[PDB]
Design an enzyme around this catalytic site. Structure first.
Site, mmCIF file in Angstrom:
data_model
loop_
_atom_site.group_PDB
_atom_site.id
_atom_site.type_symbol
_atom_site.label_atom_id
_atom_site.label_comp_id
_atom_site.label_asym_id
_atom_site.label_seq_id
_atom_site.Cartn_x
_atom_site.Cartn_y
_atom_site.Cartn_z
ATOM 1 N N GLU A 187 0.829 -1.194 0.000
ATOM 2 C CA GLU A 187 0.000 0.000 0.000
ATOM 3 C C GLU A 187 0.870 1.252 0.000
ATOM 4 O O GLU A 187 1.950 1.280 0.596
ATOM 5 C CB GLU A 187 -0.906 0.008 1.236
ATOM 6 C CG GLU A 187 -1.477 1.376 1.596
ATOM 7 C CD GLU A 187 -2.574 1.831 0.653
ATOM 8 O OE1 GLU A 187 -2.369 1.773 -0.578
ATOM 9 O OE2 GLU A 187 -3.641 2.256 1.150
ATOM 10 N N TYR A 191 -1.077 6.891 -1.050
ATOM 11 C CA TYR A 191 -2.216 7.267 -1.881
ATOM 12 C C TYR A 191 -2.906 6.098 -2.588
ATOM 13 O O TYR A 191 -4.098 6.176 -2.894
ATOM 14 C CB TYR A 191 -1.777 8.305 -2.919
ATOM 15 C CG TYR A 191 -1.156 9.552 -2.322
ATOM 16 C CD1 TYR A 191 -1.861 10.340 -1.410
ATOM 17 C CD2 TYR A 191 0.139 9.944 -2.667
ATOM 18 C CE1 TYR A 191 -1.290 11.489 -0.854
ATOM 19 C CE2 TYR A 191 0.719 11.090 -2.118
ATOM 20 C CZ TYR A 191 0.000 11.856 -1.214
ATOM 21 O OH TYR A 191 0.570 12.986 -0.667
ATOM 22 N N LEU A 249 13.861 0.538 -6.036
ATOM 23 C CA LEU A 249 14.882 0.219 -5.032
ATOM 24 C C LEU A 249 14.247 -0.923 -4.261
ATOM 25 O O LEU A 249 13.041 -0.922 -3.995
ATOM 26 C CB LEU A 249 15.232 1.392 -4.098
ATOM 27 C CG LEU A 249 16.234 2.388 -4.706
ATOM 28 C CD1 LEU A 249 15.479 3.416 -5.520
ATOM 29 C CD2 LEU A 249 17.025 3.096 -3.618
ATOM 30 N N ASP A 268 6.137 14.447 4.499
ATOM 31 C CA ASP A 268 5.772 13.196 5.153
ATOM 32 C C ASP A 268 6.920 12.210 5.231
ATOM 33 O O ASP A 268 6.780 11.019 4.939
ATOM 34 C CB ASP A 268 4.569 12.560 4.454
ATOM 35 C CG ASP A 268 3.940 11.465 5.288
ATOM 36 O OD1 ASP A 268 3.930 11.593 6.535
ATOM 37 O OD2 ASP A 268 3.453 10.483 4.705
ATOM 38 N N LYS A 316 9.386 9.571 6.597
ATOM 39 C CA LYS A 316 9.308 8.482 7.551
ATOM 40 C C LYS A 316 10.205 7.382 7.009
ATOM 41 O O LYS A 316 10.514 7.366 5.819
ATOM 42 C CB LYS A 316 7.872 7.996 7.724
ATOM 43 C CG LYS A 316 7.101 7.710 6.454
ATOM 44 C CD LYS A 316 5.652 7.382 6.817
ATOM 45 C CE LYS A 316 4.744 7.427 5.606
ATOM 46 N NZ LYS A 316 3.328 7.174 6.018
ATOM 47 N N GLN A 360 9.745 4.367 6.155
ATOM 48 C CA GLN A 360 9.226 3.628 5.014
ATOM 49 C C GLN A 360 9.357 4.394 3.706
ATOM 50 O O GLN A 360 9.356 3.783 2.648
ATOM 51 C CB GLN A 360 7.768 3.214 5.263
ATOM 52 C CG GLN A 360 6.801 4.357 5.453
ATOM 53 C CD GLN A 360 5.503 3.890 6.072
ATOM 54 O OE1 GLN A 360 5.461 3.520 7.247
ATOM 55 N NE2 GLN A 360 4.438 3.889 5.281
#
Ligand SMILES: NC(=O)c1cc([N+](=O)[O-])c(Cl)cc1NCc1cnc(Cl)nc1
EC number: 2.7.11.22
Length: 294
Positions: A12, A15, A79, A123, A125, A127
């Protein structure tokens, strides 16, 4: 799509769904993100189209933006791993300091570049930080709120992570500055070092209060204008700032000094990516090879 051959679902995205795909023609392997609607913002597509020009070694390349039907497709250079997975895999031993330093340094270079071109990530982070076998780390999936925005979740029920949100955002500031990215990166830096999220809030107020419990409840002395912020409440509890050496042990004073500057409450006092690159913490930076298991 049909020009692409799906390899597998990478999961996921902030968006929409993401697939590892192969271009049946070029044979290149890419990450394909399918985004959510009422006609799709014609302004957004222009915003996106602008990012395709944003090329830097520490920024995941946006290869293409395809608007067809009621869906939006973003094609990115691929990546194999993200920093969140890498940190989890390095939990028992920890990421060696030289590698933490290399990653922080590369991420600041990427931010300095984006910020010099007036592009904010907004945003950041773990991840959204991708790594490869060559020891490179890159900034991915920029979530420009003024490019598309964000509803209650990603777009389909998904708990938004607030752990890396700057305090000015939590206090309702409507205009984000490049400082929000430095804050998030400081939170990530601390996490690589301690192997534990710095401010793992479970709600907007818990996020804010965890920050206050550690850095002290902000006041007009350290953050001019804070008590006039949209969501500021005089009723916020007043916590004393904790000694900094307790926060990211056993990080050295060079590291603690840089982190403290990346976590200043006042966005205006918060160090810039450019200035952070000059911090003494990076005097001995190198580019180690990570032990990546793909
Ligand atoms: N640009 C990318 O390569 C990439 C893009 C997105 N995304 O568009 O959101 C996502 Cl999630 C992950 C990515 N790669 C990391 C990764 C992680 N796990 C596996 Cl199995 N394969 C790749």
């Amino acid at each position: 799509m049909e020009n692409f051959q799906k390899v597998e679902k990478i999961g996921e995205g902030t968006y929409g769904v993401v697939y590892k795909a192969r271009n049946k023609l070029t044979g290149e392997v890419v990450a394909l993100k399918k985004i959510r609607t009422e006609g799709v913002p014609s302004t957004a597509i222009r915003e996106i189209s602008l990012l395709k020009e944003l090329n830097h070694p520490n920024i995941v390349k946006l290869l293409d933006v395809i608007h067809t039907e009621n869906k939006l497709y973003l094609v990115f250079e691929f990546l194999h791993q993200d920093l969140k997975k890498f940190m989890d895999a390095s939990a028992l031993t920890g990421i060696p300091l030289p590698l933490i330093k290399s990653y922080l340094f590369q991420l600041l270079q990427g931010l300095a570049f984006c910020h010099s071109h007036r592009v904010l990530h907004r945003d950041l982070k773990p991840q959204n930080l991708l790594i490869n076998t060559e020891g490179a780390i890159k900034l991915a999936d920029f979530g420009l709120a003024r490019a598309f925005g964000v509803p209650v979740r990603t777009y389909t029920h998904e708990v938004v992570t607030l752990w890396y949100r700057a305090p000015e955002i939590l206090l309702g500031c409507k205009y984000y500055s490049t400082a929000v990215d430095i804050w998030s990166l400081g939170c990530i830096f601390a996490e690589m070092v301690t192997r534990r999220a710095l401010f793992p809030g479970d709600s907007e107020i818990d996020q804010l209060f965890r920050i206050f419990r550690t850095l002290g409840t902000p006041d007009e002395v350290v953050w001019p204008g804070v008590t006039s912020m949209p969501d500021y409440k005089p009723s916020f509890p007043k916590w004393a700032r904790q000694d900094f050496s307790k926060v990211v042990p056993p990080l050295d004073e060079d590291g603690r000094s840089l982190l403290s500057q990346m976590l200043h409450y006042d966005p205006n006092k918060r160090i810039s990516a450019k200035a952070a690159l000059a911090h003494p913490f990076f005097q001995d930076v190198t580019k180690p090879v990570p032990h990546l298991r793909l």
